[PDB]
Amino acid sequence: PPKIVWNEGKRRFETEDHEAFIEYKMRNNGKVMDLVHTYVPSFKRGLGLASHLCVAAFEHASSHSISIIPSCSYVSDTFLPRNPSWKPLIH
Ligand SMILES: CC(C)(COP(=O)(O)OP(=O)(O)OC[C@H]1O[C@@H](n2cnc3c(N)ncnc32)[C@H](O)[C@@H]1OP(=O)(O)O)[C@@H](O)C(=O)NCCC(=O)NCCS
């Protein structure tokens, strides 16, 4: 499919194996989620895993009324230009 989980205390959604993850920094007293860096290791690259990590932070922020700061350059450069319908999520 696959599967991504929320590791809240590390502040990221990540692959269950902990190796792929998108990290954020919350701001504005819980109202904003700043997506600061995303990480997929090599061998796992080019298979959409990065859109999947972004797809995990966006479905989540979206279900809680939290807007996104797209700091990570993967977010406002590849992921968002390919997923415009996520753009109204932007703070
Ligand atoms: C990029 C990251 C989100 C992992 O992504 P991923 O699962 O490989 O993303 P995918 O490979 O499926 O994405 C492919 C797309 O991401 C984009 N991308 C790659 N690096 C990027 C960057 N630094 N910033 C923005 N977008 C980028 C490419 O434009 C590519 O589109 P193209 O080949 O398809 O037409 C991120 O979590 C990471 O840490 N990457 C490290 C990547 C790296 O070190 N590459 C070294 C290449 S020498």
- What ranges do the domains of the chain cover? 1-91
Atom number in ligand 1 closest to CA 74: 25
Q: Is 82 helix (H, G, I), strand (E, B) or coil?
A: helix
The resolution, in Å, is: 2.1
CB atoms within 10 A of CB 77: 11
Q: How far is CA 7 from CA 15, 18, 23, 55, 74, in A?
A: 10, 9, 9, 15, 20
What torsion do the CA atoms of 11, 24, 80, 57 make, to the nearest 10 degrees? 20
Q: Which CATH architecture has domain 1-91?
A: 3-Layer(aba) Sandwich (3.40)
15 is in an annotated binding site: no
Q: Which atom of ligand 1 approaches the CA of 20 most closely?
A: 37
CA-nearest residue for atom 32, ligand 1, is 46
Q: Within a 10 A sphere around the Cβ of 88, how many other Cβ atoms?
A: 8
Place of tokens 């999947």: 52
By annotation, the residues acting in catalysis are 72
Q: What angle do CA 60, 10, 31 make, to 5 degrees?
A: 45
Distance 16 CA to ligand 1 centre (A): 20
Residues near 82 by Cβ (< 8 Å), separated by ≥ 6? 51
Beta strands in the chain (DSSP E): 4-7, 12-15, 21-27, 32-39, 67-69
Contacts of 45 (CB under 8 A, 6+ apart): none
